Design a protein around this ligand. Structure first.
Ligand SMILES: NC(=O)C1=CN([C@@H]2O[C@H](COP(=O)(O)OP(=O)(O)OC[C@H]3O[C@@H](n4cnc5c(N)ncnc54)[C@H](OP(=O)(O)O)[C@@H]3O)[C@@H](O)[C@H]2O)C=CC1
Ligand SMILES: [Mg+2]
Ligand SMILES: [Zn+2]
Ligand SMILES: [Zn+2]
Ligand SMILES: [Zn+2]
Lengths: 365, 365
């Protein structure tokens, strides 16, 4: 009665039908002693959802897979061991949903890097009898309390939602590599989508000197408004990197692909011993290419970063409220039709800058 | 009259004869205000000498090329603006010999990364009328003051010479990534050869917990003698990484072939947000693919390091003195025959662990 045995969600079984999710009922994950159960209110559309649904990284790990991992909802139940939340709290869930609670990472604000971590969707939870996790395009969500985040009362759910993944995912590497105060440091942000448009704002808020990089200049005016001090359209200014020798303290890639992205040219603009970090994750088949030479010129490193920690989520929300960092969203009532539309438009790149699904009651009640 | 108009060296003009250098005379570089002129005493045999002589990655940039860049010698002359060295001083030269003196990198302990820098051999020196630089298999050497290092009296020349390249090449990434006091830190050193044998000793001297890696156990007893605290034979213990979860603060690849490395195994043993760095690899311009997924689970990074700074060299030498860090060398009177024998063996891996050419007074007029 409090929690139904089955949840409802918009689901896909075949990657050929990645853009045609359909209403499905499915057995819920067990509620473990540290678990929190939400009645979902909103969910953002992350390009990770599309990569997952299209099997561009790996095959779908279950039938009727429900994606979505920028979730805001209300607590309707908690396990007996939950200490951090109570029924009626409005909270958020991002891209990871549980960890082992018994490793050093779990106890030192690296729980998103737990070796036995379970993603919010498409992932086997070994703590829940190998339940393959179900996401947030759904009436309800379950996550371990370490992966459920308090939402400030003044942040409306729709704007709060993309911060649960896009936000924390770009905030984590910026604070880790630049410090909270990034004054004097130059930061490049590649790929001005969901993640990138938030990275511009967060980097600007930290005091950094921000260069926005995009394949074209169509997003220039908005990027400038979002906190970029500098804009480069790499498809138009083909030799841009020649003016940026020894310039960047850090480069953060937020692009969904490898299409217009010459990694060597980016590395050539880093200062000595600085990092290029890709939070962007193209399909598994697609890679960047780059010679030992250009690594050698700079002592530059290439790497990636995954999500962020709960400590970091709290810091990020504080900073966001402080400097008015908010995602630019387009709200869409959840439905088979609207999810199809929104997935297709997101794939087409037609969005400024994040779709957020809303009005869950009309769908699931 | 102080400096001879011509120097003598064992030189090659055809990469087909990479391993059979012949005595030859050549006009010296002009002596610039910050230049230092050495009468050479010893020169270590570095593997990059074989890379260069064989032209495997870059063609010979002059006729009668003289390689060798692990030089110890005695100052016979200085340009009018030198202040740090006086005639009679016993000094050393590594793999870079000059830099622009007018960029941030030169200004800030990164002169080895100067964009207009000149290698100790086979490099056009834009400051010296495009003279193609000549190395230390020779009677004399000329280098810029910032690339000439004072040798402490307690360091014999033959033992000091490999510190000028191998030593700094491995010490720089250690100090840059572990800090100079690396107590409590775990470091992995891959490839126990010319470079790795010094890397073990430096890492141990800095206070680190050192794991030595090689394909077989053949170098294990030696690695243990050189400062390794434990050893992994990756061809014998194929699942070794299972016992090193979340272990390493840094991993340094000491010229082990990246193709022959299973990078993913090493990366899976790093702590969060750490680096796998490679040194001593040929500066090939051939591309190779990189994927963010390779690094994602650890927030890891991959990159390179090139030589090191004079500041770092000074620290390295003090450390070597305090802790008795010293290469294991096989001394070889310089001659055509001995150069051939040593080049052949060094190419083979058949040296324990560095050849040092000696007795220059008998070879040279
Ligand atoms: N590391 C992590 O933990 C997380 C990673 N991600 C990943 O981050 C990436 C971005 O996600 P999100 O911001 O939602 O995606 P969006 O589609 O919202 O934005 C992606 C941006 O990439 C650029 N782009 C689009 N197609 C290509 C292509 N073929 N090649 C290169 N660039 C392209 C566009 O920027 P422009 O028009 O400026 O060129 C676009 O705005 C995805 O790969 C996603 O899987 C997401 C969440 C977390
Ligand atoms: Mg003077
Ligand atoms: Zn993801
Ligand atoms: Zn854990
Ligand atoms: Zn310079």
């Amino acid at each position: 009665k409090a929690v139904p045995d089955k949840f409802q969600g918009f689901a896909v079984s075949d990657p050929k039908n990645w853009n045609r999710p359909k209403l499905a009922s499915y057995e819920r994950k067990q509620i473990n002693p540290h678990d929190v159960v939400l009645k979902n209110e909103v969910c953002g559309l992350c390009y990770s959802d599309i990569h997952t649904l299209s099997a561009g990284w790996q095959p779908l790990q279950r039938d009727n897979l429900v994606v979505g991992h920028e979730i805001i909802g209300e607590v309707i139940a908690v396990g007996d061991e939950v200490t951090e939340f109570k029924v009626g709290d409005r909270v958020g869930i991002g891209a990871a949903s549980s960890s082992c609670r018994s490793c050093q990472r779990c106890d030192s604000d690296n729980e998103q890097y737990c070796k036995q971590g379970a993603a919010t969707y498409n992932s086997k939870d070994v703590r829940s009898n190998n339940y393959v996790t179900q996401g947030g395009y759904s009436s309800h969500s379950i996550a371990d309390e370490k992966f459920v985040f308090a939402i400030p009362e003044d942040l409306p759910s729709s704007y709060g939602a993309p911060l649960m993944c896009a936000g924390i995912t770009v905030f984590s590497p910026l604070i880790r590599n630049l410090g909270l105060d990034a004054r004097g440091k130059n930061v490049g942000i590649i790929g001005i989508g969901g993640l990138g448009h938030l990275a511009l704002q967060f980097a600007n808020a930290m005091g950094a000197n921000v260069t926005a990089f995009s394949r074209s200049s169509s997003k220039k005016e908005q990027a400038m408004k979002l906190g970029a001090h500098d804009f480069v359209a790499t498809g138009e200014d083909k030799t841009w990197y020649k003016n940026y020798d020894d310039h960047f303290d850090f480069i953060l890639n937020c692009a969904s692909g490898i299409d217009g992205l010459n990694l060597s040219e980016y590395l050539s603009t880093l200062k000595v011993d600085k990092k290029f970090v890709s939070v962007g994750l193209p399909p598994s088949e697609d890679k960047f290419e780059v010679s030992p030479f250009t690594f050698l010129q700079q002592g530059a490193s290439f790497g990636s970063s995954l999500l962020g920690s709960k400590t970091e989520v709290k810091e990020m929300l504080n900073l966001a409220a402080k400097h008015n960092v908010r995602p630019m969203i387009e709200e869409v009532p959840i439905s088979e039709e609207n999810c199809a539309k929104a997935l297709d438009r997101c794939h087409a790149g037609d969005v400024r800058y994040r779709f957020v699904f809303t009005d869950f009651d009309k769908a699931f009640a």
